[PDB]
Design a protein around this ligand. Structure first.
Ligand SMILES: [Cl-]
Length: 426
Protein backbone atom coordinates (compact mmCIF):
# COMPACT_ATOMS: atom_id res chain seq x y z
CA UNK A 1 0.00 0.00 0.00
CA UNK A 2 2.91 2.40 0.31
CA UNK A 3 3.34 2.51 -3.49
CA UNK A 4 -0.37 3.18 -3.88
CA UNK A 5 -0.35 6.01 -1.29
CA UNK A 6 2.75 7.48 -2.96
CA UNK A 7 1.13 7.46 -6.40
CA UNK A 8 -2.05 8.97 -5.05
CA UNK A 9 -0.53 11.98 -3.25
CA UNK A 10 1.43 13.02 -6.33
CA UNK A 11 -1.71 12.59 -8.50
CA UNK A 12 -4.30 15.15 -9.59
CA UNK A 13 -7.38 13.06 -8.77
CA UNK A 14 -10.34 14.88 -7.22
CA UNK A 15 -10.16 15.42 -3.51
CA UNK A 16 -13.06 13.05 -2.52
CA UNK A 17 -11.37 10.24 -4.45
CA UNK A 18 -8.02 10.96 -2.77
CA UNK A 19 -9.79 10.73 0.54
CA UNK A 20 -11.55 7.45 -0.11
CA UNK A 21 -8.25 5.96 -1.21
CA UNK A 22 -6.47 7.32 1.89
CA UNK A 23 -9.26 5.75 3.98
CA UNK A 24 -8.48 2.38 2.41
CA UNK A 25 -4.74 2.89 3.07
CA UNK A 26 -5.56 3.71 6.73
CA UNK A 27 -7.71 0.55 6.99
CA UNK A 28 -4.80 -1.48 5.51
CA UNK A 29 -2.99 -1.04 8.86
CA UNK A 30 -5.39 -3.44 10.53
CA UNK A 31 -3.79 -6.50 8.91
CA UNK A 32 -0.79 -8.65 9.55
CA UNK A 33 2.17 -6.95 7.88
CA UNK A 34 5.77 -8.01 7.80
CA UNK A 35 8.66 -5.82 8.92
CA UNK A 36 9.55 -4.60 5.42
CA UNK A 37 5.95 -3.54 4.77
CA UNK A 38 5.79 -1.64 8.06
CA UNK A 39 9.12 0.09 7.56
CA UNK A 40 8.21 1.11 3.99
CA UNK A 41 5.00 2.79 5.26
CA UNK A 42 6.83 4.48 8.12
CA UNK A 43 9.43 5.85 5.66
CA UNK A 44 6.79 7.18 3.28
CA UNK A 45 4.53 8.68 5.93
CA UNK A 46 7.47 10.36 7.62
CA UNK A 47 8.45 11.90 4.24
CA UNK A 48 4.89 13.20 3.77
CA UNK A 49 4.77 14.68 7.25
CA UNK A 50 8.13 16.46 7.07
CA UNK A 51 8.28 17.24 3.35
CA UNK A 52 4.62 17.20 2.32
CA UNK A 53 4.14 20.02 -0.21
CA UNK A 54 0.75 21.05 1.14
CA UNK A 55 -1.39 20.69 4.26
CA UNK A 56 -3.32 17.80 2.73
CA UNK A 57 -0.18 15.72 2.09
CA UNK A 58 1.14 16.30 5.62
CA UNK A 59 -2.25 15.49 7.09
CA UNK A 60 -2.44 12.21 5.13
CA UNK A 61 1.08 11.35 6.41
CA UNK A 62 -0.10 11.95 9.99
CA UNK A 63 -3.27 9.85 9.56
CA UNK A 64 -1.55 6.90 7.97
CA UNK A 65 1.40 6.96 10.39
CA UNK A 66 -0.94 7.03 13.40
CA UNK A 67 -2.85 4.02 12.12
CA UNK A 68 0.27 2.04 11.22
CA UNK A 69 2.01 2.87 14.51
CA UNK A 70 -1.15 1.93 16.46
CA UNK A 71 -1.53 -1.47 14.81
CA UNK A 72 2.20 -2.16 14.50
CA UNK A 73 3.67 -0.65 17.60
CA UNK A 74 6.83 -2.81 17.88
CA UNK A 75 7.78 -1.96 14.29
CA UNK A 76 7.24 1.70 14.98
CA UNK A 77 9.40 1.33 18.10
CA UNK A 78 12.24 -0.08 15.89
CA UNK A 79 11.83 2.69 13.38
CA UNK A 80 11.59 5.63 15.83
CA UNK A 81 14.82 4.67 17.57
CA UNK A 82 17.50 6.65 19.42
CA UNK A 83 19.84 6.83 16.42
CA UNK A 84 17.05 8.10 14.14
CA UNK A 85 15.93 10.72 16.66
CA UNK A 86 19.48 11.90 17.29
CA UNK A 87 20.03 12.04 13.54
CA UNK A 88 16.99 14.27 13.11
CA UNK A 89 18.25 16.66 15.77
CA UNK A 90 21.80 16.87 14.44
CA UNK A 91 21.38 16.55 10.70
CA UNK A 92 17.78 17.43 10.03
CA UNK A 93 15.93 15.48 7.31
CA UNK A 94 16.21 15.66 3.52
CA UNK A 95 15.75 19.38 2.69
CA UNK A 96 14.91 20.34 6.30
CA UNK A 97 17.63 21.71 8.56
CA UNK A 98 17.90 20.42 12.12
CA UNK A 99 16.34 23.65 13.51
CA UNK A 100 13.09 23.22 11.55
CA UNK A 101 9.99 23.29 13.77
CA UNK A 102 8.48 20.39 11.75
CA UNK A 103 11.29 18.16 13.03
CA UNK A 104 10.68 18.88 16.68
CA UNK A 105 6.94 18.50 16.02
CA UNK A 106 7.48 15.04 14.46
CA UNK A 107 9.60 14.01 17.49
CA UNK A 108 6.86 15.14 19.89
CA UNK A 109 4.28 13.21 17.85
CA UNK A 110 6.56 10.16 17.82
CA UNK A 111 6.99 10.22 21.60
CA UNK A 112 3.18 10.02 21.94
CA UNK A 113 3.22 7.00 19.65
CA UNK A 114 5.99 5.15 21.54
CA UNK A 115 5.19 6.32 25.05
CA UNK A 116 3.92 2.82 25.99
CA UNK A 117 7.13 1.17 24.68
CA UNK A 118 10.22 0.25 26.66
CA UNK A 119 12.51 2.25 24.34
CA UNK A 120 10.84 5.46 25.55
CA UNK A 121 12.97 5.56 28.72
CA UNK A 122 16.24 5.85 26.84
CA UNK A 123 14.63 8.40 24.51
CA UNK A 124 13.75 10.53 27.50
CA UNK A 125 17.30 10.29 28.79
CA UNK A 126 18.65 11.17 25.37
CA UNK A 127 16.26 14.08 25.10
CA UNK A 128 17.20 15.56 28.50
CA UNK A 129 20.71 16.01 27.11
CA UNK A 130 19.62 17.27 23.69
CA UNK A 131 17.06 19.81 24.96
CA UNK A 132 19.67 21.42 27.25
CA UNK A 133 21.99 21.66 24.23
CA UNK A 134 19.14 23.14 22.16
CA UNK A 135 18.41 25.97 24.62
CA UNK A 136 22.15 26.75 24.99
CA UNK A 137 22.15 27.32 21.22
CA UNK A 138 19.70 30.29 21.44
CA UNK A 139 16.82 28.94 19.38
CA UNK A 140 14.29 31.16 17.66
CA UNK A 141 10.94 31.70 19.39
CA UNK A 142 8.90 29.40 17.14
CA UNK A 143 11.21 26.42 17.79
CA UNK A 144 11.40 27.25 21.48
CA UNK A 145 7.57 27.31 21.68
CA UNK A 146 7.37 23.86 20.09
CA UNK A 147 10.00 22.66 22.52
CA UNK A 148 7.78 24.03 25.27
CA UNK A 149 4.73 22.05 24.04
CA UNK A 150 6.88 18.94 23.97
CA UNK A 151 8.28 19.39 27.47
CA UNK A 152 4.85 20.25 28.85
CA UNK A 153 3.59 16.88 27.52
CA UNK A 154 6.70 14.95 28.46
CA UNK A 155 8.25 16.29 31.64
CA UNK A 156 10.66 13.38 31.67
CA UNK A 157 12.53 15.21 28.88
CA UNK A 158 13.29 18.19 31.14
CA UNK A 159 16.81 18.09 32.56
CA UNK A 160 16.76 17.04 36.21
CA UNK A 161 18.57 17.83 39.48
CA UNK A 162 21.29 20.48 39.20
CA UNK A 163 20.79 20.58 35.43
CA UNK A 164 17.22 21.78 35.91
CA UNK A 165 18.70 25.09 37.18
CA UNK A 166 21.18 25.27 34.34
CA UNK A 167 18.28 24.63 31.96
CA UNK A 168 16.24 27.49 33.42
CA UNK A 169 19.19 29.89 33.30
CA UNK A 170 19.94 29.03 29.72
CA UNK A 171 16.26 29.37 28.86
CA UNK A 172 16.23 32.87 30.39
CA UNK A 173 19.32 33.78 28.31
CA UNK A 174 17.56 32.34 25.28
CA UNK A 175 14.45 34.42 25.87
CA UNK A 176 16.71 37.47 26.11
CA UNK A 177 17.76 36.89 22.49
CA UNK A 178 14.23 36.59 21.10
CA UNK A 179 13.30 39.03 18.34
CA UNK A 180 10.81 39.26 15.50
CA UNK A 181 12.28 40.91 12.35
CA UNK A 182 8.89 40.81 10.60
CA UNK A 183 6.70 43.92 10.80
CA UNK A 184 3.59 42.12 9.48
CA UNK A 185 0.99 42.14 12.22
CA UNK A 186 0.16 38.40 11.88
CA UNK A 187 3.80 37.43 12.53
CA UNK A 188 3.87 39.71 15.54
CA UNK A 189 0.78 38.13 17.15
CA UNK A 190 2.43 34.75 16.54
CA UNK A 191 5.69 35.93 18.10
CA UNK A 192 3.93 37.01 21.27
CA UNK A 193 1.99 33.75 21.53
CA UNK A 194 5.22 31.80 21.00
CA UNK A 195 6.99 33.74 23.73
CA UNK A 196 3.99 33.23 26.02
CA UNK A 197 4.32 29.44 25.62
CA UNK A 198 8.00 29.50 26.52
CA UNK A 199 7.29 31.68 29.53
CA UNK A 200 4.46 29.37 30.63
CA UNK A 201 6.84 26.40 30.54
CA UNK A 202 9.31 28.20 32.72
CA UNK A 203 6.61 29.31 35.23
CA UNK A 204 5.54 25.67 35.42
CA UNK A 205 9.07 24.58 36.11
CA UNK A 206 9.25 27.16 38.94
CA UNK A 207 6.12 25.66 40.52
CA UNK A 208 7.37 22.06 40.19
CA UNK A 209 10.95 22.79 41.33
CA UNK A 210 10.99 25.97 43.48
CA UNK A 211 14.80 25.99 43.59
CA UNK A 212 14.81 27.06 39.93
CA UNK A 213 12.91 30.29 40.61
CA UNK A 214 15.56 32.41 42.33
CA UNK A 215 18.41 31.49 39.95
CA UNK A 216 16.08 32.21 37.01
CA UNK A 217 15.20 35.66 38.28
CA UNK A 218 18.85 36.38 39.00
CA UNK A 219 19.56 35.63 35.37
CA UNK A 220 16.83 38.08 34.31
CA UNK A 221 18.56 40.69 36.46
CA UNK A 222 22.00 39.93 35.00
CA UNK A 223 20.53 40.39 31.51
CA UNK A 224 18.76 43.68 32.12
CA UNK A 225 21.61 45.17 34.13
CA UNK A 226 24.21 44.31 31.45
CA UNK A 227 26.43 47.15 30.23
CA UNK A 228 27.74 45.08 27.29
CA UNK A 229 27.36 47.61 24.43
CA UNK A 230 27.06 44.91 21.74
CA UNK A 231 23.93 43.27 23.25
CA UNK A 232 20.42 44.55 23.92
CA UNK A 233 18.22 42.04 25.79
CA UNK A 234 14.79 41.43 24.28
CA UNK A 235 11.69 42.95 25.88
CA UNK A 236 10.35 39.41 25.67
CA UNK A 237 11.84 39.00 29.18
CA UNK A 238 8.77 40.97 30.34
CA UNK A 239 6.68 37.86 29.68
CA UNK A 240 8.37 36.23 32.70
CA UNK A 241 7.71 38.82 35.30
CA UNK A 242 3.98 39.10 35.34
CA UNK A 243 3.31 36.63 38.17
CA UNK A 244 6.28 36.95 40.54
CA UNK A 245 5.38 37.30 44.21
CA UNK A 246 5.84 40.81 45.59
CA UNK A 247 8.25 39.78 48.32
CA UNK A 248 10.56 38.35 45.66
CA UNK A 249 10.55 41.59 43.70
CA UNK A 250 11.56 43.34 46.92
CA UNK A 251 14.56 41.06 47.48
CA UNK A 252 15.78 41.56 43.92
CA UNK A 253 15.36 45.34 43.81
CA UNK A 254 16.96 45.67 47.25
CA UNK A 255 20.02 43.64 46.17
CA UNK A 256 20.33 45.51 42.87
CA UNK A 257 20.22 48.95 44.58
CA UNK A 258 22.20 48.35 47.87
CA UNK A 259 24.89 45.79 46.91
CA UNK A 260 28.13 47.80 47.18
CA UNK A 261 29.60 46.03 44.15
CA UNK A 262 26.88 47.14 41.70
CA UNK A 263 28.01 49.99 39.44
CA UNK A 264 25.77 53.02 38.71
CA UNK A 265 25.88 52.08 35.01
CA UNK A 266 24.33 48.67 35.73
CA UNK A 267 21.48 50.24 37.69
CA UNK A 268 20.83 52.75 34.91
CA UNK A 269 20.63 49.87 32.44
CA UNK A 270 18.30 47.82 34.66
CA UNK A 271 15.98 50.77 34.93
CA UNK A 272 16.07 51.52 31.17
CA UNK A 273 15.40 47.88 30.33
CA UNK A 274 12.52 47.59 32.82
CA UNK A 275 10.86 50.68 31.47
CA UNK A 276 11.16 49.14 27.97
CA UNK A 277 9.22 46.14 29.30
CA UNK A 278 6.20 48.44 29.09
CA UNK A 279 6.55 47.89 25.30
CA UNK A 280 5.66 44.18 25.69
CA UNK A 281 2.10 43.66 24.42
CA UNK A 282 1.06 41.90 27.65
CA UNK A 283 2.81 44.32 30.06
CA UNK A 284 0.00 44.55 32.62
CA UNK A 285 2.14 44.54 35.86
CA UNK A 286 5.47 45.96 34.67
CA UNK A 287 4.69 49.14 36.59
CA UNK A 288 5.09 47.18 39.85
CA UNK A 289 8.71 46.52 38.93
CA UNK A 290 9.52 49.95 37.48
CA UNK A 291 8.05 51.87 40.44
CA UNK A 292 9.79 49.59 42.98
CA UNK A 293 13.07 50.41 41.25
CA UNK A 294 12.33 54.13 41.01
CA UNK A 295 11.69 54.13 44.75
CA UNK A 296 14.62 51.85 45.49
CA UNK A 297 16.94 54.24 43.63
CA UNK A 298 15.63 57.36 45.40
CA UNK A 299 16.29 55.68 48.78
CA UNK A 300 19.99 55.35 47.97
CA UNK A 301 19.92 58.85 46.45
CA UNK A 302 20.64 57.91 42.84
CA UNK A 303 18.89 61.07 41.72
CA UNK A 304 20.95 61.73 38.59
CA UNK A 305 20.11 58.28 37.29
CA UNK A 306 16.41 58.96 38.01
CA UNK A 307 16.51 62.33 36.37
CA UNK A 308 18.52 61.26 33.31
CA UNK A 309 16.50 58.09 32.70
CA UNK A 310 13.24 60.02 33.06
CA UNK A 311 14.33 62.51 30.41
CA UNK A 312 15.36 59.57 28.22
CA UNK A 313 12.22 57.52 28.64
CA UNK A 314 9.27 59.70 29.56
CA UNK A 315 8.04 60.09 25.96
CA UNK A 316 7.99 56.31 25.56
CA UNK A 317 6.06 55.94 28.80
CA UNK A 318 3.52 58.57 27.79
CA UNK A 319 3.01 56.90 24.39
CA UNK A 320 2.18 53.59 26.11
CA UNK A 321 -1.05 55.21 27.26
CA UNK A 322 -2.40 54.47 23.76
CA UNK A 323 -2.37 50.71 24.56
CA UNK A 324 -5.35 49.93 26.81
CA UNK A 325 -3.90 46.88 28.66
CA UNK A 326 -0.68 48.67 29.68
CA UNK A 327 -2.29 52.09 30.17
CA UNK A 328 -3.00 51.92 33.93
CA UNK A 329 0.62 50.80 34.55
CA UNK A 330 2.05 53.41 32.17
CA UNK A 331 0.00 56.09 33.96
CA UNK A 332 1.31 54.97 37.35
CA UNK A 333 4.89 55.23 36.04
CA UNK A 334 4.27 58.58 34.32
CA UNK A 335 2.64 59.95 37.41
CA UNK A 336 5.53 58.95 39.68
CA UNK A 337 8.07 60.45 37.24
CA UNK A 338 6.28 63.74 36.74
CA UNK A 339 5.44 64.32 40.38
CA UNK A 340 9.00 63.45 41.50
CA UNK A 341 10.72 65.61 38.79
CA UNK A 342 10.06 68.96 40.45
CA UNK A 343 13.14 71.13 39.63
CA UNK A 344 12.55 71.77 35.90
CA UNK A 345 9.75 71.70 33.36
CA UNK A 346 11.86 69.76 30.88
CA UNK A 347 10.28 66.28 31.44
CA UNK A 348 6.74 67.62 31.46
CA UNK A 349 7.44 69.73 28.35
CA UNK A 350 8.57 66.61 26.50
CA UNK A 351 5.06 65.20 26.87
CA UNK A 352 3.10 68.37 26.37
CA UNK A 353 2.99 68.06 22.56
CA UNK A 354 1.28 64.63 22.82
CA UNK A 355 -1.49 65.49 25.29
CA UNK A 356 -4.18 66.99 23.03
CA UNK A 357 -4.13 64.15 20.54
CA UNK A 358 -4.46 61.54 23.29
CA UNK A 359 -7.23 63.41 25.05
CA UNK A 360 -9.11 64.14 21.86
CA UNK A 361 -8.87 60.48 20.87
CA UNK A 362 -10.35 59.07 24.08
CA UNK A 363 -12.86 61.62 25.35
CA UNK A 364 -15.66 60.76 22.87
CA UNK A 365 -14.93 57.07 22.29
CA UNK A 366 -18.08 56.11 24.24
CA UNK A 367 -16.12 54.17 26.89
CA UNK A 368 -16.63 54.97 30.56
CA UNK A 369 -13.22 53.41 31.26
CA UNK A 370 -11.69 56.05 28.88
CA UNK A 371 -13.51 58.84 30.72
CA UNK A 372 -12.27 57.64 34.17
CA UNK A 373 -8.73 57.40 32.76
CA UNK A 374 -8.98 60.98 31.50
CA UNK A 375 -10.19 62.22 34.89
CA UNK A 376 -6.89 60.87 36.32
CA UNK A 377 -4.70 62.17 33.49
CA UNK A 378 -6.23 65.66 33.53
CA UNK A 379 -5.73 65.86 37.29
CA UNK A 380 -2.04 65.07 36.79
CA UNK A 381 -1.75 67.52 33.92
CA UNK A 382 -3.36 70.31 36.02
CA UNK A 383 -0.84 69.70 38.78
CA UNK A 384 2.06 69.99 36.35
CA UNK A 385 0.75 73.19 34.74
CA UNK A 386 0.35 74.73 38.17
CA UNK A 387 3.77 73.63 39.35
CA UNK A 388 5.36 74.76 36.04
CA UNK A 389 3.23 77.88 35.48
CA UNK A 390 4.14 80.78 33.18
CA UNK A 391 3.84 79.09 29.76
CA UNK A 392 0.34 80.32 28.70
CA UNK A 393 0.78 79.80 24.92
CA UNK A 394 2.18 76.29 25.42
CA UNK A 395 -0.68 75.34 27.79
CA UNK A 396 -3.69 76.95 26.03
CA UNK A 397 -4.49 74.13 23.63
CA UNK A 398 -4.24 71.61 26.50
CA UNK A 399 -6.55 73.69 28.71
CA UNK A 400 -9.05 73.79 25.81
CA UNK A 401 -8.86 70.05 25.25
CA UNK A 402 -9.41 69.26 28.95
CA UNK A 403 -12.00 72.01 29.79
CA UNK A 404 -14.80 69.49 30.34
CA UNK A 405 -12.89 67.48 32.97
CA UNK A 406 -12.64 68.13 36.71
CA UNK A 407 -9.99 70.58 37.79
CA UNK A 408 -8.53 69.89 41.19
CA UNK A 409 -8.64 72.70 43.78
CA UNK A 410 -5.45 74.72 44.30
CA UNK A 411 -5.35 73.34 47.83
CA UNK A 412 -5.53 69.77 46.54
CA UNK A 413 -2.84 70.47 43.88
CA UNK A 414 -0.39 71.81 46.49
CA UNK A 415 -0.81 68.69 48.63
CA UNK A 416 -0.32 66.40 45.61
CA UNK A 417 2.87 68.32 44.82
CA UNK A 418 4.22 67.68 48.34
CA UNK A 419 5.35 64.29 46.97
CA UNK A 420 9.09 63.62 47.63
CA UNK A 421 11.11 65.31 44.88
CA UNK A 422 14.28 63.93 43.40
CA UNK A 423 17.12 66.15 44.60
CA UNK A 424 18.67 67.91 41.56
CA UNK A 425 22.46 68.56 41.43
CA UNK A 426 23.42 65.52 43.54
CL1 LIG B 1 0.66 79.17 32.58
Amino acid sequence: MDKILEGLVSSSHPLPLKRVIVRKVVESAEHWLDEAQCEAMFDLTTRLILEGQDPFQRQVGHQVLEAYARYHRPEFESFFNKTFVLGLLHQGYHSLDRKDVAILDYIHNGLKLIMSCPSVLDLFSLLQVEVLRMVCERPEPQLCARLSDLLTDFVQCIPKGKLSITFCQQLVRTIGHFQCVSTQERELREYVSQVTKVSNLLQNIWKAEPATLLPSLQEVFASISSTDASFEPSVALASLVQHIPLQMITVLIRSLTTDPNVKDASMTQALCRMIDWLSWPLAQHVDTWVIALLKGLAAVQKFTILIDVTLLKIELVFNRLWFPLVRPGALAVLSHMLLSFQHSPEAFHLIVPHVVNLVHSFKNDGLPSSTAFLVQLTELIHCMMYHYSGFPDLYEPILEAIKDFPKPSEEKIKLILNQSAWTSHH
